[PDB]
Design a protein around this ligand. Structure first.
Ligand SMILES: N[C@@H](Cc1ccc(O)c([N+](=O)[O-])c1)C(=O)O
Ligand SMILES: N[C@@H](Cc1ccc(O)c([N+](=O)[O-])c1)C(=O)O
Ligand SMILES: N[C@@H](Cc1ccc(O)c([N+](=O)[O-])c1)C(=O)O
Ligand SMILES: N[C@@H](Cc1ccc(O)c([N+](=O)[O-])c1)C(=O)O
Ligand code: NA
Ligand code: NA
Lengths: 311, 311
């Protein structure tokens, strides 16, 4: 497993693998990701931070944007409060083990030169394209605002401003990134991570949809959340519990079961787990129980680092 | 005729007359108008400059924005060239007799605080409202750009930034001004001047439609343009020649005619002219001839001031 395969692990798409290969030959390389500050940091965040750590171990210089200004544009409240959530988010990301350069968008995104560039990009971006690129990002609004279409070109310009080699995001970011790749002189390699299904199975996992597991949830909270989750037997597609097994659990893995249900079961790989589960050889409740306990152990260091701040 | 009536002369609407009355009681009062730089200055410009001179004589401090940045947003070309046209436009406005403070939008519209305000207004302005407000302003584009909707909120913020008492524009500006009146804490009095019909009668007079009389056109040019113009007998509505008689000619006025067509005719007022013309007592060609000669004499000082620069 070389650096390229490590980086590709568990991604949905890399635009493009040949360009990424060229980047990996450089000694000095940069990757960045931006996060609108969020009041709870959940497994979707952690999946992305995990990817930044992968890149960091591949020799990348890592930048994390606390995207306070685009969060303001996306109707998340005042800037001062957004900034305070940003500082909390940074502490969580540090607790996750990421030492990086943390920057607030408003530190530079209001400079004359940045703004002039944003306006130059606004001349090249159609309203229709801008709106399409925000479909999975914009706060729901029956009356969309001008701010919605300024949002994507801020994110495009950021990649230009920083000269970063690689941009990372969830798949929800992919249309903004392909806009960047179309408009900017330097083409950024984009790495997109899968969108986690929320615990209800109804939509995507989000801080605003109340369908997430937070990295600092208590053990009892996690058990309850998993126990209630959508997880139909034989079904992997849109199964949030199977997703968690695929992206966060360490293998080989021992699923503990009562002997009257077959007793303990050791899987050496997610793919092994997947066949057992598709073949209805693994009951949803036994999967839930194992996922819950292993995730508790996975998140424990993060929760304890954050709880030590209170102590 | 007091200051209020002088200011109201030949306007299409004042939003609102009661607010304007309150402004006129102040000793220190400000009015502004903005112009995207234009390669030819025409009678539509002159009508608006005439209104600024009216205000100036009413004791208003006058500001003229050479709107280089919004012109850039509206797809009029580079900024450096736009700025050069702006400087030419200023010289024409001076030749028209307006001594004022001339400012370029880019001198201040890119400052951090200005931009932050623009983004705050973008949170309160719907895309639909922004687009509607640009219907008569935006360059024709089958694929409208994000820049189109940033444009109006720049103009709104400008009024906020300057704290001006009065904003002046053609009626094409009225939806942007009513947006300003809705969003800003200080309500600006808006004075709207009529939109001149182009010489073809087909649409509005514009620098880009080639249907205008420029203030520096030669006498022979003006005669030709007027001679070719739409001017149907008995019709005042959308008659560009009658419009010119109403907004630019001095009364009383002598229309010279051959005796075989009734001989010279003296009208003491546009309204007099209008009845003679509606009653088909005035032939279009005699109207054209008089309009042409009087307009030539009206524009002569402007043309000579500008021609003295070459000399
Ligand atoms: N769109 C990201 C936030 C973001 C990512 C990258 C960026 O460069 C910027 N930005 O420039 O403000 C913002 C989100 O959904 O959380
Ligand atoms: N179309 C997406 C947009 C969206 C998704 C998730 C979110 O958390 C937010 N949000 O915070 O505003 C917005 C949706 O399902 O709503
Ligand atoms: N919309 C005006 C130009 C303009 C008027 C007033 C203004 O404040 C600004 N502006 O702020 O850039 C621009 C035109 O059609 O020519
Ligand atoms: N809808 C208007 C917009 C417009 C009018 C006049 C103009 O000069 C320009 N322009 O310069 O782009 C634009 C039109 O008839 O085209
Ligand atoms: Na080296
Ligand atoms: Na006084």
């Amino acid at each position: 497993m070389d650096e390229f395969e490590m980086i590709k692990r568990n991604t949905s798409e890399i635009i493009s693998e040949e360009e990424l290969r060229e980047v990996l030959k450089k000694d000095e390389k940069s990757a960045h990701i931006g996060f609108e500050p969020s009041g709870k940091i959940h497994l979707g965040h952690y999946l992305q931070i995990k990817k930044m750590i992968d890149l960091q171990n591949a020799g990348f210089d890592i930048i994390i944007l606390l995207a306070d200004l685009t969060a303001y544009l996306n109707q998340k409240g005042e800037l001062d409060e957004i900034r305070k959530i940003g500082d909390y988010n940074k502490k969580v990301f540090e607790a996750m083990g990421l030492k990086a350069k943390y920057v607030y968008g408003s530190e530079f995104q209001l400079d004359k030169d940045y703004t002039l560039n944003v306006y130059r990009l606004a001349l090249k971006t159609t309203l229709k394209r801008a709106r399409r690129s925000m479909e999975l990002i914009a706060r729901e609004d029956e009356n969309p605002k001008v701010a919605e279409v300024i949002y994507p070109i801020m994110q495009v310009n950021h990649a230009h401003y920083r000269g970063v080699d690689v941009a990372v995001g969830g798949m929800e970011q992919r249309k903004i990134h392909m806009l960047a790749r179309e408009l900017l002189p330097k083409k950024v390699v984009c790495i997109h991570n899968p969108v986690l299904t929320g615990l209800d199975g109804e939509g995507k996992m989000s801080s605003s949809k109340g369908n997430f597991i937070a990295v600092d949830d208590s053990p009892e909270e996690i058990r309850a959340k998993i126990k209630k989750a959508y997880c139909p037997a034989g079904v992997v597609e849109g199964n949030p519990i199977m997703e968690i097994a695929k992206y966060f659990l360490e293998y080989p893995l021992t699923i503990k079961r009562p002997e009257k249900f077959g007793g303990d079961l050791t899987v050496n790989s997610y793919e092994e787990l997947e066949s057992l589960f598709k073949n209805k050889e693994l009951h949803p409740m036994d999967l839930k129980n194992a996922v819950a306990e292993e995730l508790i152990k996975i998140l424990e260091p993060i929760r304890k680092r954050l709880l030590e701040h209170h102590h």
